[PDB]
């Protein structure tokens, strides 16, 4: 499992002067992904008579 940074998002505007205030902007997003592992197998056999 691993994390992913979706987007940083906008934080802070070019606000005017003489304004005792500010704007919360918009927070980003951080997703949390994960992935499995798959297996690969098979079979093969003989007759043990020609093998000798």
């Amino acid at each position: 499992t691993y994390m992913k940074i979706a987007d940083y998002g906008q934080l802070g505007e070019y606000t005017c002067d003489a304004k005792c205030d500010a704007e919360f902007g918009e927070p980003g997003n951080i997703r949390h992904l994960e992935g499995k592992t798959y297996d690969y197998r098979g079979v093969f056999c003989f007759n043990r008579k020609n093998l000798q």
Binding site: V43, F44, C45, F46, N47, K49, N50
Partner: protein, 98 residues
């Protein structure tokens, strides 16, 4: 004689559905001939002799030829009483016997 010099060997090493043993050696031929393809005669005379023997031996008359010379074991009347041999069919069919 199968020529020991092999022309190819198409083997299939490694398998679990048939365990790759072998497909057996097979052979095709003909044992035919001409428009006179075969003759079942020659072995018809023993058949006819067996027929006549079974006509004139319905099964109550004691008939027995002897194989071994000394005796069998006990006081019994030998024995070969079979048919197709006391009539001459076996020694006429032996000509077509391997």
């Amino acid at each position: 004689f199968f020529p020991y010099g092999s022309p190819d060997r198409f083997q299939t090493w490694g398998d679990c559905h048939t365990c790759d043993v072998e497909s057996q050696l097979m052979a095709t031929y003909v044992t035919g001939r001409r428009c006179e393809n075969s003759v079942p005669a020659g072995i018809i005379i023993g058949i006819l002799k067996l027929i006549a023997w079974n006509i004139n031996n319905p099964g109550d008359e004691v008939m027995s030829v002897r194989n071994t010379l000394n005796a069998n074991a006990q006081g019994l009347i030998g024995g070969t009483n079979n048919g197709a041999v006391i009539s001459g069919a076996q020694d006429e069919w032996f000509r077509y016997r391997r």
